[PDB]
Design a protein around this ligand. Structure first.
Ligand SMILES: COc1ccc2nc(C)c(O[C@@H]3C[C@H]4C(=O)N[C@]5(C(=O)NS(=O)(=O)C6(C)CC6)C[C@H]5/C=C\CCCCC[C@H](NC(=O)OC5CC(F)(F)C5)C(=O)N4C3)nc2c1
Ligand SMILES: [Zn+2]
Length: 198
């Protein structure tokens, strides 16, 4: 009934991948209970830092990456959901189901990656466990893992970045190609497709 119709909660930042030093490591900034409440209210007063955020809904967790002032992630994770912020839910600035892409204004305190113009094919995928995985670029939107591994290790890292040797953003991870559960390749939204969307 119209009186009982519910609304989906906001995407909530629950942590980040720390890339500031010599060692990449995941940090949690909010536990599951506070995540649930923040998803319902859409208010998040937690300080945001860094480039790669770990984000969660009521039912899914995944990554979001700031590039050029936009926090980017995948539609198959976020749908059309708002993101929680200090002053309430923030509506998406970009939505493209055809690219599996959404974006919101980058949160206050985040740092953005610079879009890559190197034209290099030696990439690095950053996962939600702060693994830095070498990937050889194989096309506009595909790359092969130098060391294949079970897809389990990539699950939950959609929205994470592929970076060039210089640390620029080359793309946003969206899907894994596997054979008998072993990830051999990845698909990503290229930064140029983001830059067009911008
Ligand atoms: C509904 O509207 C939309 C619109 C456009 C969409 N567009 C895509 C491509 C898509 O694909 C879904 C979700 C995504 C995924 O699982 N993303 C990862 C992930 O981690 N998600 S996640 O964070 O855990 C989660 C679900 C958010 C919480 C990163 C990968 C890690 C492990 C894979 C597990 C097995 C799955 C292997 C599979 N592979 C594949 O589809 O291969 C082919 C696509 C191709 F490349 F062309 C070949 C795969 O990867 N996906 C399946 N749904 C869309 C939905
Ligand atoms: Zn570069």
């Amino acid at each position: 009934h119209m009186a009982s119709m519910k609304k989906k909660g906001s995407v909530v930042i629950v942590g980040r991948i720390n890339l500031s030093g010599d060692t990449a490591y995941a940090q949690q900034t909010r536990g599951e209970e506070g995540c649930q409440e923040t998803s319902q209210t859409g208010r998040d007063k937690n300080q945001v830092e860094g480039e790669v955020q770990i984000v969660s809904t009521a039912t899914q967790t995944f990554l979001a990456t700031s590039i050029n002032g936009v926090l980017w992630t995948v539609y198959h994770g976020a749908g059309t959901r708002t993101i929680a912020s200090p002053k309430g839910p923030v509506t998406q600035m970009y939505t493209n189901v055809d690219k599996d892409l959404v974006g919101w204004q980058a949160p206050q305190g985040s740092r953005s990656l610079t879009p890559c113009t190197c034209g290099s094919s030696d990439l690095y995928l950053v996962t939600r466990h702060a693994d830095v995985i070498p990937v050889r670029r194989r096309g506009d939107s595909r790359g092969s893992l130098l060391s294949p591994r079970p897809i389990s290790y990539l699950k939950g890292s959609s929205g994470g970045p592929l970076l060039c040797p210089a640390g620029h953003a080359v793309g946003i991870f969206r899907a894994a190609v596997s054979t008998r559960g072993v990830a051999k390749a990845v698909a990503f939204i290229p930064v140029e497709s983001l830059e067009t969307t911008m």
